Amino acid sequence: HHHLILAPMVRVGTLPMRLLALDYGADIVYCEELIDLKMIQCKRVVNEVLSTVDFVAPDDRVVFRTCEREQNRVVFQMGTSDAERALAVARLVENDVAGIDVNMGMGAALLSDPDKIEKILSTLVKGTRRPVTCKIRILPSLEDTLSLVKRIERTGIAAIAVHGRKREERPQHPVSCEVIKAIADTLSIPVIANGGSHDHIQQYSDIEDFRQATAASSVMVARAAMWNPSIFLKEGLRPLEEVMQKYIRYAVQYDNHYTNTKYCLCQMLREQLKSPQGRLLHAAKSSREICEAFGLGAFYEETTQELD
Ligand SMILES: Cc1cc2nc3c(=O)[nH]c(=O)nc-3n(C[C@H](O)[C@H](O)[C@H](O)COP(=O)(O)O)c2cc1C
Ligand SMILES: [Cl-]
């Protein structure tokens, strides 16, 4: 069995989506990118009410929320440009996560500064027992990409995710499978293929096809999982209505901010946002209003009473 990974996605990658992807067969779940400058201000809070581990900012906002169900499968992705700050964030979350990822697709800007990438990654590798990973974008020239990935490997990281697109490449531009294959061949660490949604990934069987075309260790899915998290289910895609209700149940059970639930459902609805249900969802001013838009009003009242 080759690993099915939920790609890190800002706003999308909150707890309900990670748990939903796990239900449908994802082996590893990356969280949304969280900026180190925000994380360093947080305190670890055990939440008995929700049975979660919360990372709470001084304004009482829960920045990251995790639970036991995903403890051995959640990869924390940080946005960082400083090694000491990166390590302090890693030290905060390491007991509640299975991996620490560094965003290098801060982000794309880091690829132009390999001394910084190297400093941050080597500091993380030496500072935590958790496997350290990074997610990169391919460089304009193959030789530069190959030198870069070898230099990153020499830091001691556990694996590398490769989005087969260059910094200036829009989602409409095709992915470079041949470049991902060149990286996988030159490295002894696992290489995770990425950048395959829509153009290559529309159904489950497409995942293994993308892995074989890139000769990679595993596949990381973003857009296709965002549109329908049941993309990870070997038996085939589940009806969207069924997936959205399953999503809302987790959003309510783990007290997800209604604007975040609304955003994730909007991403799944796509063209169906013009339907009466898509309209009810856009108008929703609370979690109860999202639930009533999807026939989960009674579930909301029952769940709420138990949590209160
Ligand atoms: C809504 C959205 C948010 C994203 N946020 C992140 C992020 O937090 N971290 C990251 O490294 N990449 C982020 N990405 C990039 C994806 O992880 C991924 O590299 C890209 O979508 C290509 O994979 P795909 O073809 O499976 O969608 C984001 C992509 C989308 C669609
Ligand atoms: Cl990216």
301 annotated ligand binder = no
CA-nearest residue for atom 10, ligand 1, is 8
Q: Is residue 142 part of a domain?
A: yes
Cβ–ligand 1 contact at 228 (below 6 Å): no
How many Å lie between the centroid of ligand 2 and the Cα of residue 105? 4
3-state secondary structure of 197: strand
CB of 280 closer than 8 Å to CB of 293:
yes
Place of tokens 């193959």: 142
Look up the domain containing 188 and give its range: 4-227
Q: Is 51 left (phi over 0), alpha (psi -120 to 50) or beta?
A: left
From CA 226, how far away is CA 17, in angstroms rounded? 8
DSSP 8-state code for residue 175? P
Tokens 């779940």 correspond to 29
Q: Strand pairing partners for 76?
A: 100
Backbone gaps in the chain, preceding residues (C–N over 2.5 A): 105
Q: Determine, yes or no, domain membership for 87.
A: yes
* Number of domain units in the chain: 1
| C-beta of 10 in contact with ligand 1 (< 6 A) | yes
Experimental method: X-ray
Phi-psi region of 144 (alpha: psi -120 to 50; beta: other; left: phi over 0): alpha
Any domain includes 190: yes
- The domain that contains 90 carries what CATH number? 3.20.20.70
Q: Which ligand is nearest to the CA of 76?
A: 1
Closest among 93, 94, 110 to 102, alpha carbons compared: 110
Take residue 288 and report the two structure tokens written for it.
Answer: 């109860």
Element at 85 (helix H, strand E): helix 83-93
- Is 268 part of a structural domain of the chain? no
Is there a binding annotation on residue 295? no
Cα Rg of the chain (Å, integer): 19
Specify whether the CB–CB gap between 225 and 207 falls below 8 A. Answer: no
Rounded Cα distance, 21 and 27, in Å: 9
Which residue in the block uniquely carries the two structure tokens 């990281």? 157
Q: Give domain status of residue 178, yes or no.
A: yes
- Residue 222 labeled ligand binder: yes
For residue 277, is it within any domain? no
Dihedral of alpha carbons 61, 64, 26, 95, sign: negative
